Amino acid sequence: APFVAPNVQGRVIKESGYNTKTFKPAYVKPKHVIDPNMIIPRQPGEALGTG
Amino acid sequence: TSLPNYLAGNGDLGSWEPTQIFAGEADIVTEGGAAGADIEIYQVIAKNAAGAMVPHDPTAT
């Protein structure tokens, strides 16, 4: 705080302000198609000969 | 190699036809020896000038 001889008026002190930030999200769309070509052949845990 | 064949077809799984080898009852004699050419199974074999096992062929100079 400023030093002032006790006759004179005084000193005035400045101040500060604000800031802002904004954001927007991004959009994600993965997918799969399923044929009969993917369903039919053998999933690995299945016995030989007859599925 | 993945296409689940959708068609309609006849086919064979195979044809087994046994290969009997022995025609008599005499004793068998075996040995291993070093080859010199490419040998199939039950192919008749001679020995060349080096001592290998070349498959048999008459009329060789």
TrEMBL record, chain A:
Taxonomic superkingdom: Viruses
Protein localization: Virion; Host cytoplasm
Coiled coil stretches, renumbered: none
Assembly with partners or alone: Homomultimer.
Function summary: Assembles to form an icosahedral capsid. The assembly is primed by the interaction between capsid assembly protease and portal dodecamer, and major capsid proteins assemble cooperatively to form the procapsid with the help of capsid scaffolding protein. Major capsid protein forms hexons and pentons of the icosahedron. Viral genomic DNA is packaged into the procapsid through the portal vertex. The packaging triggers a dramatic reconfiguration of the capsid shell.
Similarity remark: Belongs to the lambda phage major capsid protein family.
Identification of the protein by name: Major capsid protein
Automatic annotation (TrEMBL), chain B:
Superkingdom of the organism of origin: Viruses
Protein name in UniProt: Putative+head+decorative+protein
Organism of provenance: Salmonella phage YSD1
Lineage: Viruses, Duplodnaviria, Heunggongvirae, Uroviricota, Caudoviricetes
